[PDB]
């Protein structure tokens, strides 16, 4: 369920 710029605006949170 990997996070990218599409799901969140926070760079820290991307896999």
């Amino acid at each position, epitope marked *: 369920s990997l996070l*990218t*710029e*599409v*799901e*969140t*605006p*926070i*760079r*820290n949170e991307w896999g």
Partner: antibody, heavy 119, light 114 residues
Framework: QVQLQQSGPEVVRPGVSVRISCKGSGYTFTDYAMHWVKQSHAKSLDWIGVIGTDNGNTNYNQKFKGKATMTVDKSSNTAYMELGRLTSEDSAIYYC????????????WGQGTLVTVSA | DIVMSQSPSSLAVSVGEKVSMSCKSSQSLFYSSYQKDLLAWYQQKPGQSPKLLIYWASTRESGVPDRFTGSGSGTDFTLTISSVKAEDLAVYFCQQYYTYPLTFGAGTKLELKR
């Protein structure tokens, strides 16, 4: 020399759709998503949504669900936004924009595309 | 959605004045992992796209004059111009990037007092 180059102005009849483009040059296209922003004349800015340039996945502001579609042609470094079934509320300048190297603040903007909805 | 409230909507200024404008978010924008607030400011003039001024609440973008200062943490943010110049007449917007959808304030427009 990051540049976001948008398509030119559009006059579109009510009830039809319009396809606008944003070509990213001077950088690695797939390393940054493309965001789109509406500015109604004399108004504020509204974020429409984001498309991953690498994965093609999208995330729309629920305010624009079913109004806006986003696509990308990676081979062309071009992102496209389709605005559907236009009404006079859709008349505005539309920008593409992208982040710098960190979180999603907009360091680079296209020059905007003017959409005027009229018969 | 995170509501960004800017005030005043318009401000009449005089060259050389210190100018202050407010941006309040309906939720905290503080992000612990960075120890920064996820807030940016923009300047926009007629006929142009917005230009980035400040990010993480207080870092000036390169090339932005040092008379622009961003401050605040949590919900209550301020953009200060220490000594306003005529070239600073524009609309200023704030934006949060804590979460989607991204959201902007309605702007503060600087006009000249007479």
């Amino acid at each position: 020399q990051v540049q976001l180059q948008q398509s030119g102005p559009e006059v579109v009849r009510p009830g039809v759709s319009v396809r606008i483009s944003c070509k990213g040059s001077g950088y690695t296209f797939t390393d940054y998503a493309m965001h789109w922003v509406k500015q109604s004349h004399a108004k504020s800015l509204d974020w429409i949504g984001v498309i991953g340039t690498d994965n093609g996945n999208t995330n729309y502001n629920q305010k624009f669900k079913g109004k806006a579609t986003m696509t990308v042609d990676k081979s062309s470094n071009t992102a496209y936004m389709e605005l559907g079934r236009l009404t006079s509320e859709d008349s505005a300048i539309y920008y593409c924009a992208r982040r710098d190297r960190d979180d999603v603040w907009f360091a680079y903007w296209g020059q905007g595309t003017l959409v005027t909805v009229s018969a | 959605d995170i509501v960004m409230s800017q005030s005043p909507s318009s401000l009449a200024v005089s060259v050389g004045e210190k100018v202050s404008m407010s941006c309040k978010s309906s939720q905290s924008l503080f992000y612990s992992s960075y120890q920064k607030d996820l807030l940016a400011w923009y300047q926009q003039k007629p006929g142009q796209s917005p230009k980035l001024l400040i990010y993480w609440a207080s870092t000036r973008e390169s090339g932005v004059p040092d008379r622009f200062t961003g401050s605040g943490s949590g919900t209550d943010f301020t953009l200060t111009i220490s000594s306003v110049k005529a070239e600073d007449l524009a609309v200023y917007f704030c934006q949060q990037y804590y979460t989607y959808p991204l959201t902007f304030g309605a702007g503060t427009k600087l006009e000249l007092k007479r």
